[PDB]
Amino acid sequence: PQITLWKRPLVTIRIGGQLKEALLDTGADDTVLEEMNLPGKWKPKMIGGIGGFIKVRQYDQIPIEICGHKAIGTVLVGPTPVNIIGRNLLTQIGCTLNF
Amino acid sequence: PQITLWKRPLVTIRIGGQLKEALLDTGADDTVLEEMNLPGKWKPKMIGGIGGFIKVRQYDQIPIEICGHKAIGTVLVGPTPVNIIGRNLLTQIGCTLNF
Numbered sequence A, B: 001p002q003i004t005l006w007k008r009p010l011v012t013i014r015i016g017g018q019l020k021e022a023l024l025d026t027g028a029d030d031t032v033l034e035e036m037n038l039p040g041k042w043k044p045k046m047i048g049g050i051g052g053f054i055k056v057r058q059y060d061q062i063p064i065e066i067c068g069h070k071a072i073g074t075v076l077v078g079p080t081p082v083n084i085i086g087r088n089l090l091t092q093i094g095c096t097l098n099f
């Protein structure tokens, strides 16, 4: 797929049977998801943005389907209005920027 | 170019004859650069993000050369963790996401 940037690059993601909308976000190092229960141990982390930092829960080796592509990796859960798919998962599905 | 995401997509930009590094960020609607003096009128603006709401200065119709590609568009100047090239300029330079 080619996705233009005229609009926010939102796509469908599935994680453990929850279906959500997420932003493909080449700026983000990590993937930050809206509040959700995930299985397994988590540890606190702090992630920075334009306004400062938010505290998130880091979960490792979480499977997320993104546009039919299987990804498995680190997911940070915290108070975001938008699910963001970061480089850690964007790389796994073979996502590039092109111009 | 085609740019993979195993590293941050940092490129060199040229603005007002100044060279800077900035992040190609599909998750940002807007372009936000660290504090700098640009010529011409600016408008105070407040923008929100992860962390919170910050004050920025909005400069319209600013030429910026991104990795050799010319844009002329709105640049926000304020306290950002990193210089951010957002969709408003990414679209100008023909940037798309592909997987």
Ligand SMILES: COC(=O)N[C@H](C(=O)NCCCC[C@@H](CO)N(CC(C)C)S(=O)(=O)c1ccc(CN)cc1)C(c1ccccc1)c1ccccc1
Pocket (backbone or CB within 6 Å): A023, A025, A026, A027, A028, A029, A030, A046, A047, A048, A049, A050, A051, A080, A082, A084, B025, B027, B028, B029, B030, B031, B032, B047, B048, B049, B050, B051, B081, B082, B084, B086
């Ligand atoms: C531990 O390492 C980090 O903190 N890395 C930072 C990081 O990956 N942060 C993830 C936060 C989300 C990033 C960003 C979009 O890319 N956020 C938007 C998203 C939540 C919808 S955002 O920062 O909140 C944001 C909001 C609004 C605009 C313009 N209107 C631009 C940016 C990253 C970064 C990336 C983009 C913006 C701000 C920070 C970084 C931090 C410090 C230095 C370099 C990169």
